[PDB]
Structure formats: C-alpha cells, structure tokens
Symmetry: C2
Subunit: 298 residues, 2 copies
C-alpha cells in the first residue's frame, strides 16, 4: 500500500518566488494576489521580537521583488491577514485553478508541493499530527510551500509552511494566515506538544489490509468503547470518540467486522507487536491513512 499524493499540476502553475530584503521564499499566486508567509520582511534580527505592523508600514509597493519563472510581477498593493502577506499584483494569474481555502483538523491528510526559490522540487503526502505539526522534508527555502487536496477541478488549499521547530517538525498556517497549533511566526522556545498516534487512522488502515486480503491480526474478542480507550492511551494513541466510530461505519459494513471488534484487534496488536510479520508492507501501525483515503484507493 502506497501513500499517494495529488497530481500537483494545478498547484505547480501558481508557485512564484518572492524576495524582500535579503530574504527569499515561495508565494502562492491566485487571481491578482500573491500569498506568502509574513516573515519575508523580518531581518531575522526582527525574528526574536518582530512588530509586523511596524515593519510593514515602512514598506513601499516597490519593496517587493516578485518573480514567476521568467517574468517580474509588479506589486500594486500590499496588506496582511493574520500571518499571511497578501500582495496585490498587476496581472491576474491565468493558470489560477479552481480553489477554496480550507482549514483542516488534525488527523486529516493532504499533499505538499515542496518548492525552492519558486521552483517546484517535489510532491509528497503527509498528515497533520494531533500536536499540530507536519512531519516532512523541508530544506531551508521551503517557506511558503502549500498543502492541498484536489477534488474535481477544485484545489482545497489547507496549509502554508512557515517554521521548522527544534523537534525537527514543521509548523504552518492555513491560507488565511492563522497558525495550526500554539505556534507563532517568532523565535520563542515553542516546542511541539507530545505527539500521539491517530487511532482512527490506524483502524482504517487495518480495514484496508483486510480488504486487500489479510486477516491474521483479527481475533475472537471485542471491546467496549471505554475499555479500548483506557488501553490505547497507554501507548500514546488518540482517544476514539463516537464520531470516530460513525466515520468508520462504511468500511465496517463492507467487510463484515464490527468497529469495536476491529478495536479488539488493535488491542492485541499493540500488546504483541507483529511477530516478524508485516501489514501492507509496514512493520509499524500506520496512522497517515484516513478513512476517506482508504475508501478511495481500495
């Protein structure tokens, strides 16, 4: 089983480079506006304690060198929405796809077009962790790269990359500029909270392995909902809510295995390990597959 990213074409055409001062990073070009992280304007001296309203009011339109591959791009206006700098530009992007700006919730999956200096470098599928971070591959220069789902024509932009956190993990905002998590585009001592496993996702990953013909982890047991949580907590798993149960109903009725019976297997797998075995090619319990993802690609 393969983690599958979305075909990045519609995003590729919106990736531009944005420069301010000595700083350069990526921006997102939709419809005569260019979205980018607001720290493009800090001197990294300003990073310890930046007054953004003060640094921005000291900037002219001409202070923003914006390039889209070959051609410059005139900035005729500039404003700030929460942590995102919104750059009015001379020309509307003709490759603007159909889009929306979505704020996802932790556990949900999306794809990331990692870029450098406005050049797309690669694409990958990841997940927002319960502690509001993204475990990803970002060299210095990924700032501004975006996270999205594509649905029919419609790119659902849900994430823009801002910061690396000491843990090695990545913090960003939605495309409105509100951070995911207790993180601030500033140089504090913010550490990521304690990560947890997305219990609802590993369960859905377990149905897929049965659907693709693996039954060896099941058993004869079942478990109350409360009993299952009190056990999984001990392994740093996210509580399983009645909402999480309902979400799984589809995948249950397709396989014939009740959702709490399936939790009975997760309990056994957590107590035993896999005894040398694997599941869809992993020796780990995979939490970056959501119920939606499993229904689509199985």
């Amino acid at each position: 089983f393969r983690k599958m990213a979305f075909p990045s074409g519609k995003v590729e055409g919106c990736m531009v480079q944005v420069t301010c001062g000595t700083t350069t990073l990526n921006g997102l070009w939709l419809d005569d506006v260019v979205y980018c992280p607001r720290h493009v304007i800090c001197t990294s001296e300003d990073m310890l304690n930046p007054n953004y309203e003060d640094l921005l009011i000291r900037k002219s339109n001409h202070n923003f060198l914006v390039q889209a591959g070959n051609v410059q791009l005139r900035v005729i206006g500039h404003s700030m929405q929460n942590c995102v700098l919104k750059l009015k530009v001379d020309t509307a992007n003709p490759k603007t796809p159909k889009y929306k700006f979505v704020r996802i919730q932790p556990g949900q999956t999306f794809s990331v077009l990692a870029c450098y200096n406005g050049s797309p470098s690669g694409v990958y599928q990841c997940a927002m962790r319960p502690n509001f971070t993204i475990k990803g591959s970002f060299l210095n220069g990924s700032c501004g790269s975006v996270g999205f789902n594509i649905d029919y024509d419609c790119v659902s932009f849900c994430y823009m990359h801002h910061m690396e956190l000491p843990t090695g993990v990545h913090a960003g905002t939605d495309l409105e500029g509100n951070f995911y998590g207790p993180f601030v585009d500033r140089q504090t001592a913010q550490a990521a909270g304690t990560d947890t496993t997305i219990t609802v996702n590993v369960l859905a990953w377990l149905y897929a392995a049965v659907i693709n013909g693996d039954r060896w982890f099941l058993n004869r047991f079942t478990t109350t909902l409360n009993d299952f949580n009190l056990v999984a907590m001990k392994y740093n798993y996210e509580p399983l809510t009645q909402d999480h149960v309902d979400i799984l109903g589809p995948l249950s009725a397709q396989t014939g295995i009740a959702v709490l019976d399936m939790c009975a297997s997760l309990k056994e797998l957590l107590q035993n390990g896999m005894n040398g075995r694997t599941i869809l090619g992993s020796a780990l319990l995979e939490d970056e597959f959501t119920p939606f993802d499993v229904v689509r690609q199985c």
Copy 2:
C-alpha cells in the same frame, strides 16, 4: 519522506483509449498516442493472442482517443513491440521536452496513475530486482506511465501493463520492451524471488546519519567479500565497486567510509534493529537511491 516529481508536465499528456470494451490510458506526444498493445484484445482474445494478426484486421475507427472532452480522430496505427502507436489528427499543445529512457533495477521513478485518462495521483517507486514493482493499482490503470524529470525534461521509463498474483505490477519501457520475464498474454506468470536493493539501504542509512540517527554505527569494518557472503544469505543483491564509488559523495559528507557503514548494516541484518527504528521505519527501506538521498539532503 518519499518524494515524487512535480506531475503537471505529465498530467497534460494523459488521454483515454477505448477499443471495444477495454478502456485504458494513453500518452499523447506530438500527434501520436502511446498505449499498451493489449487494448485490442478481449475476453477470449488474450488467452493466446496473435498480435500481428489482431491488428492487421482493425482500422482507425476501432480506437476512441479522448482528451477529456475533445475526441482526437485516429489517422494511423502501428506497433513497436508491445506499445501501440496511434497517429492522431491534432498535435498536443502541452507536449513537453522528453526522452524515452529505460531504467535499471533499483532505480526510482514517479508513477502518475490515472483512471480512464484522468489522473488519480502520483507516487514514488522503485524497479525491483525481479523487475516487478510494489504497491497497488487496479483495473483502469494500464497505460499510466513512469518518469523522472531532470531539467525541463521528462524522462519516461515505464508503462503499466499487467498485474500478477503477487499483488505487483509489470510493464514495458516506452518502446514496448518488457521489464522482466513477462508477456502481454493472460496465462500464469509469477515474480521470481525478489531481493533487497543493498546500495539503497546504505544510502538510506547515510540519510539517517545525515539527520542524527547515529546509533547503528559501530567502530568496525567488514570488507567486500565478507559482506557479500552475508548479502547472499539475507537475499540482498551483492555490493559492487561501482556501488561504492557511487556512495563516495555520502561517505565524504559523514566521515563514514562505505565499508564501515556495511558492518553497521550487517549487525542489523544479523541482530536486527533491536527495538529502535531508523527515521521511523522498522524496515531497512530500499526505495531511496543514493541520488534520491542527495537530491533531498
């Protein structure tokens, strides 16, 4: 993380090819459409098709090439080996700069998997030693292509043809030559025993020490002959001298000579990883090449 190429230069090449009641994918590049030759076969045909014969009878009006909504009219058809080349009336505007390439086992490429011509998603992939490739597709995904990009330039490696009982896939290079001992005929085929790609494990292990996974090292050193004897009994492909020189760039940037790293690997092949993981896998993953590692470090 595993990191596929930007897909949009290829997305704008995916078209649908229907012939009878098989419908699969095709690649449209400058007035030709590329496609598995087993589109011209049916229920009973593909139990032993004579392909030269099945195609000398059919004509252009047995092929339905659709680029989304716009239908392309086919104005000539030829085979190469197992690729079917349908000439069409309209040259593709979105045609990119491109080469046909044939990759080697243990090389990586990106699969832009599509269904009836519209692309589903992209993933990163390796050509296994047994010449199959791991993961899953299903019914509609033949004609989905594999590729690398270098500079402006899409290098096409692969075209999906077959699935096999292992749960794994079989395809040709873009010139119609099969990768592996497989045929575009519906009778019983199987992967050979696949082996693990030794030089990609070493490049992975380097990528670990490049990110401060520093504990699987030892102060020790095996050598090429003594290491390969291990390789043979854990079903790892042998390490070569070209395998070492390739890893120089990564040995240069660590202090870790390549054979030292091999002693580390042996004691993981023997003992195991002993509880811990390396970059969050309990497996010694081997679908990252030395170039892949550097391209992302």
